[PDB]
């Protein structure tokens, strides 16, 4: 067996501020390669046409992405990391907007 882990589940937004979003997800339930950490990627239609890697070496299944812009649409996906590399992407999260800065 020399394969990466399975793809995690769709990340769920659990909390929103004007500069941060908190996400949670689960490892792939199918028996497979062991997960050693997670990678988080973010997309915004106002921030370029590629996904930006916003966190890596994430040990937990919950993490807060900070340094975001107010009143902005973000989408997120997670990859699982293992001995032989990265999983394919999880499903993309439902889009959310950060809170406004009033």
């Amino acid at each position: 067996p020399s394969s990466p882990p399975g793809a995690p589940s769709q990340p769920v937004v659990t909390e929103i501020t004007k500069n941060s979003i908190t996400l949670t997800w689960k490892p792939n339930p199918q028996t497979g390669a062991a997960v050693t950490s997670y990678v988080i990627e973010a997309f915004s239609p106002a921030a370029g046409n590629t996904w930006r890697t916003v966190a890596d070496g994430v040990q937990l299944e919950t993490h807060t992405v900070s340094g975001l812009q107010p009143n902005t649409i973000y989408l997120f996906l997670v990859r699982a990391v293992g001995a032989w590399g990265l999983s394919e992407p999880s499903p993309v999260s439902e889009p959310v907007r950060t809170q406004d800065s009033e």
């Binding site: 020399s2 394969s3 032989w84 590399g85 990265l86 394919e88």
Partner: peptide, 11 residues
Amino acid sequence: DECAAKMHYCH
């Protein structure tokens, strides 16, 4: 060496 044989860091 993330590019070694059987590695799948890059997709």
